[PDB]
Amino acid sequence: KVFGRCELAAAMKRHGLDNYRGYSLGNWVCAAKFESNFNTQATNRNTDGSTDYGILQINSRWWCNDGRTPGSRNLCNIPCSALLSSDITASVNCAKKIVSDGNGMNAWVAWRNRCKGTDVQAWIRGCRL
């Protein structure tokens, strides 16, 4: 599924990401834009052989099992394919664990490089939320 901008903001809010660990909703929409262009089916291989999955490009090195990342962990206790669903619940619940792991949203390199220090509220401007 490819979400609209305000549609995804609303779904993330419904799932409790708005201001989760102090990160206002625009942070999450910004991250999802650059990670996946709001496409739940996005997958991308990492240089270490792991893969990033879904709208927030959650990796199999640490967070999910895809059966082909030797020596990895599955700290969200989910198959990586669950992160590709049109239902964003698994991606959101796993994102909550990730952002709670100590480094906040810096866990998403794309957030640190493209959203951190920017006017992220712009990503939810005009949305009825």
Curated annotation (Swiss-Prot):
GO terms for biological process: cell wall macromolecule catabolic process; defense response to bacterium; defense response to Gram-negative bacterium; defense response to Gram-positive bacterium; killing of cells of another organism. This is Lysozyme C. The gene is LYZ. Its main location: secreted. SUPFAM superfamilies: Lysozyme-like. It is an enzyme of class 3 (hydrolase). Lysozymes have primarily a bacteriolytic function; those in tissues and body fluids are associated with the monocyte-macrophage system and enhance the activity of immunoagents. Has bacteriolytic activity against M.luteus. It catalyses: Hydrolysis of (1->4)-beta-linkages between N-acetylmuramic acid and N-acetyl-D-glucosamine residues in a peptidoglycan and between N-acetyl-D-glucosamine residues in chitodextrins. It comes from Gallus gallus. GO terms for molecular function: beta-N-acetylglucosaminidase activity; identical protein binding; lysozyme activity. One of its GO terms (cellular component) is endoplasmic reticulum. Disulfide bonds join C6-C127, C30-C115, C64-C80, C76-C94. Substrate binds at D101. Keywords: Allergen, Antimicrobial, Bacteriolytic enzyme, Disulfide bond, Glycosidase, Hydrolase, Secreted, Signal. CDD domains: LYZ_C. Monomer. Lysozyme C is capable of both hydrolysis and transglycosylation; it also shows a slight esterase activity. It acts rapidly on both peptide-substituted and unsubstituted peptidoglycan, and slowly on chitin oligosaccharides. It comes from the Eukaryota. Its EC number is 3.2.1.17. It is found in: Secreted.
